Amino acid sequence: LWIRPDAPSRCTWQLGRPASESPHHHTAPAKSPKILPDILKKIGDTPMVRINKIGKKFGLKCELLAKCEFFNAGGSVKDRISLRMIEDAERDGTLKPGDTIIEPTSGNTGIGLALAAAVRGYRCIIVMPEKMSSEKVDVLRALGAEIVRTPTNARFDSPESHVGVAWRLKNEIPNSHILDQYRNASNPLAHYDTTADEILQQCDGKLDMLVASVGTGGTITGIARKLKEKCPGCRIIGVDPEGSILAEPEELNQTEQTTYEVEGIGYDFIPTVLDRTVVDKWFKSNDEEAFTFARMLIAQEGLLCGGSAGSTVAVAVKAAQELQEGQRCVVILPDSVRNYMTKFLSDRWMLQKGFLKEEDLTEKKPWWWHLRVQELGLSAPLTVLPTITCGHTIEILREKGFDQAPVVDEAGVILGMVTLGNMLSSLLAGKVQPSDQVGKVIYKQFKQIRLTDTLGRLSHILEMDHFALVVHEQIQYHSTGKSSQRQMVFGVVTAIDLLNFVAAQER
Amino acid sequence: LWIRPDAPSRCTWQLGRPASESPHHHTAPAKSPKILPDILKKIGDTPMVRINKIGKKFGLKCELLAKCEFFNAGGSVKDRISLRMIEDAERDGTLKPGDTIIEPTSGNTGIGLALAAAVRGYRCIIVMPEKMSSEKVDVLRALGAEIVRTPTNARFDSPESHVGVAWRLKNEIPNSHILDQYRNASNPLAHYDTTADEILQQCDGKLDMLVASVGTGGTITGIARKLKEKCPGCRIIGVDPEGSILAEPEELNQTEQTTYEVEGIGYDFIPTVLDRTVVDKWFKSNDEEAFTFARMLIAQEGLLCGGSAGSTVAVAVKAAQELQEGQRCVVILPDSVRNYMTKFLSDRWMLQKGFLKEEDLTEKKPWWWHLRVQELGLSAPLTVLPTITCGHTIEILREKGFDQAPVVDEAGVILGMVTLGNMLSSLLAGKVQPSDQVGKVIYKQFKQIRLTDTLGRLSHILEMDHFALVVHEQIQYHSTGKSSQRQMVFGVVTAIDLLNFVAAQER
Amino acid sequence: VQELGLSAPLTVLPTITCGHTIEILREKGFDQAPVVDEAGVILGMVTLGNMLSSLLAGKVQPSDQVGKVIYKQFKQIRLTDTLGRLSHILEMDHFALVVHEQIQYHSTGKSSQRQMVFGVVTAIDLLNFVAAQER
Ligand code: HEM
Ligand code: HEM
């Protein structure tokens, strides 16, 4: 009953055959009106961005271009797929309003279909492998679509795979569909009708190479067929993650790990729409190579593009090494960074998975990075209690000659810090009166830092909080049966003082 | 030495004066090139989207339109400001490459300037109040810009306010520019030259109303002056958060809360660029309405927009009640949802800050939501130890009619669960052999659930993990202190079984 | 002087028994700890090596309090003072107890004073610091 997704294609398209032989409907990429009837019309005509620093740094003689396909409605290149598939299904009459649309997804197809459903009222059921970020869940719950997860390492044909659950669901609930992104011909057709046309029109149809990731089979086949039909000289590369079976010939697939940390590319089967014959050479790329290039993309060109583009530019800085002056390289950037905010963008996760190493983290930092905070000029001869009046504090601080002081309880529990200037501004503004206690103007946000920690830790703490209260704590022993813990503020540091210290040491 | 940001405007503009009197260069928009020379050219000509369900539900007789200004490069409506200010500064010659650009910001001018700096090489320092989400800190770090935080509740005039820290830095770091978004005339001028032109051209200049947030002063003044000059009949409204001072007349500001949870609107002063007299009427909006309307925007129109796009439509569903058929309402949606993923999009945070009550989150749920999980048909008659061979397991399970079994160690620790269907596929694929132990096929991830928790908790657990292992644990006492713990797998439930139960009970 | 490896994570009260001290300092990996009264007034220092020798000599017993072996004399030094001042202090006294004192205000006149031991430095540590920094 169930239909495999890896079955060989029945398609009969072959290079050189005129489009008049196409059994499939072709949609005109007509320009959208001046007022989009709804968000779904903001899918198409994404910009073609020239990329400067990466191409120059790694010795690319040819102009390197990137097709930014992360400014679609949902933020991905799986938003042409949802629109095209829904349009075609409704046109052919296979679907009616109010139906339930099940769709196994590698990620962004889930978001695209959820958005289209929420706009047109369909009840959507998305099935995702368990490895996908939670940021692709929080953006689905808000859309209201149901979400079902499947085990990460289940082989596609087994019942627990992320297509086995989808097909079983389609049988339990009546009046439900599976648009089947793996097999539907509308998947690559969307690209063959819009993605290829836009590239050809923008680049004047004179591009001597292309790159593109894989994992659906659409972004590569749908573009390759048109490019070879109208731009025969284009060398159409591929990509794949080390651990997938899509890449050919078999020699490049000889690695064993069954899971990889790039979300959206590679698979353990050949999708039916994947027209491999159009590829001209397959590379591979591995997690760290992808993340350490996504970070540098963001940092050096402002292209806010996510993980699956790191691999796609990594492969470019190799495959195009043989190009010469006057030729153009075109790449595809599948998705926006919004789906990886807790992933590789987070230093913590990058170091935890070791795609960076600490020496890489420090080599790029100025000289003073390793100096211990103990070396700064910091002190706090005075302290204040929370019960004092603001009128009393304004005189105490000035008569002592200090502009700020910590606020501590009777025993040592730090509560916050108070500053003269803010207190005076509050008094003048009338928000508090001199008789009023300081409890209404005390700064309650701060973070402790201990003397040993390097200035690097201080600089990574000031990114969250203005005040870094240097403190020291002691355990006191009575008889091993009674003990107490105590701490005392030992001066505070702030970005102002840190930069002043760096300047003074430099000067 | 330091210059206040709230000083009265020195501008002499007044309705009806010819444009030839403008002392400021106007950057007339021109058709964008087919290949953007870099990302900074994807700033302008964002779509205009009619909004269907919100307008109809709340009795808006008029066409309600939205200007989606969250498809700019940085994902915000503060990306025209960053581009325009940098370009004008360079044109004036006040700036040279390699300089340090310090800018106090509410969070989105920060990202815009960080992008427009990392593209051109400037060393950017961004000062930002502590209240802004960490999801902007993460996106700033990747861009490599220095970041400095300031206390949340510091009065603007105090030295510890974000403007104060910005000016103190500028006064000490050599070769440093402070573009001062609050005072620069380019801030509103950018909108007056581009934002107004696009709205006028798209909407045919026949809009009888407008809405817009405030907090910078630019989005409203810049659009308002042009709309009044060329579309005199537009009824221009403002907005503001309860707790801010920008709103007029003063009678509306009589509230005492000094902090509000919307990021980027309102302030404790009147920015100089804010040309208030162009407003025709003001309102206020409070946190809960804004967040609820942001959620009900996302869930019902696919317009992915963040917190400040909630207030800007909650205000519309009131101010436009007086409109009639045939007239157009235009709103401004500042930012993209990428900056709030941990915030209101997260049910956890929403409930924690109580902007939703549990009954609100439970009313719309189907009937079975309150049933207890023990209501389901669930059992686990047998178990297997990890040391068993796959050959043994495939014969144990098939003979009894069962197809899956938990994996339990000798003591009782749950290790994982194995499915017969996946084991057979693994054997056929050659990844394992019958002599091999199950350690290579055991699913590693699952989540526990106890018999008392409702099916709602189960449905919120299945959004993260395929398997929900219904377990049970008992504490056992030998004699008082010599306690011990034990746990057993009672039954396993999956989305398939939950949906099947719902269907069977319904039928 | 703040450039040294000065530290003092723990402290003891004068009434503690010597057995408790010999066990605490060893189980915590340290060998010396300041003796601080309840109010925070520094009283002296106690060292594991001397206490163990005293136990073996019979001058004290494990149940005995540390009051009979506490070192009585020292001299305070504040973190701002140069190593020259520390060297001219160590010519008179073995222990230089680095401390910090704070005035705490309830309301102007109703003031109070507090202090704590931030670290202890001795000629051994000073010379070792010089040697390591040079090398
Ligand atoms: C000369 C033009 C074309 C010819 C002769 C052609 C022929 C066909 C035919 C007869 C089928 C139905 C096969 C079946 O139902 O068993 C088919 C399906 C399909 N075609 Fe085409 N078609 C053309 C255009 C295109 C184009 C432009 C694309 C993509 C760029 C495409 C991709 C596909 C795909 C993916 C399928 C479905 C394969 C499957 O479901 O296994 N076709 N084609
Ligand atoms: C008839 C057209 C205009 C006239 C007569 C005019 C006149 C002036 C003058 C003389 C100044 C300098 C004031 C000073 O340096 O103290 C100024 C600044 C300024 N103008 Fe215009 N200008 C025009 C166009 C515009 C437009 C189109 C905008 C916004 C849409 C604008 C907003 C501003 C702002 C924000 C300032 C800065 C005020 C300050 O920094 O204190 N002006 N204008």
Numbering used by the authors:
A (entry chain F), B (entry chain E): 42 to 548
C (entry chain G): 414 to 548
Show the paper's wording:
The RD adopts the evolutionarily conserved Bateman module, consisting of two tandem CBS motifs (CBS-1 and CBS-2) and a surface-exposed loop (residues 516–525) extending from a CBS-2 motif. Here we show using cryo-electron microscopy that full-length human CBS in the basal and SAM-bound activated states polymerises as filaments mediated by a conserved regulatory domain loop.
We pursued the cryo-EM structure of full-length CBS initially using two constructs: one where an N-terminal His-tag was removed during purification (CBSFL) and one with a permanent C-terminal His-tag (CBSFL-CHis). Micrographs of full-length CBS from both constructs in vitreous ice clearly showed the presence of flexible filaments of varying lengths agreeing with 2D classes. Multiple maps were processed using both helical and single particle reconstruction to resolutions of between 3.9 and 3.0 Å. In the basal state, CBS regulatory domains sterically block the catalytic domain active site, resulting in a low-activity filament with three CBS dimers per turn. The domain-swapped dimer, previously observed in crystal structures, is the repeating unit, and helical formation is driven by inter-dimeric RD interactions, i.e., between the RDs of neighbouring subunits of the filament. Here the RD sits atop the active site entrance of the catalytic domain hindering substrate access. Loop 516–525, a β-turn-β extension from the CBS-2 motif in the conserved Bateman module, plays a key role in driving oligomerisation. Though both full-length CBS constructs resulted in highly similar filament maps, one key difference was the observed protein degradation and the presence of slightly shorter oligomers of the CBSFL construct without a permanent His-tag. The CBSΔ516–525 protein, which does not form filaments, is less thermostable than CBSFL by ~5 °C, confirming that filamentation increases stability.
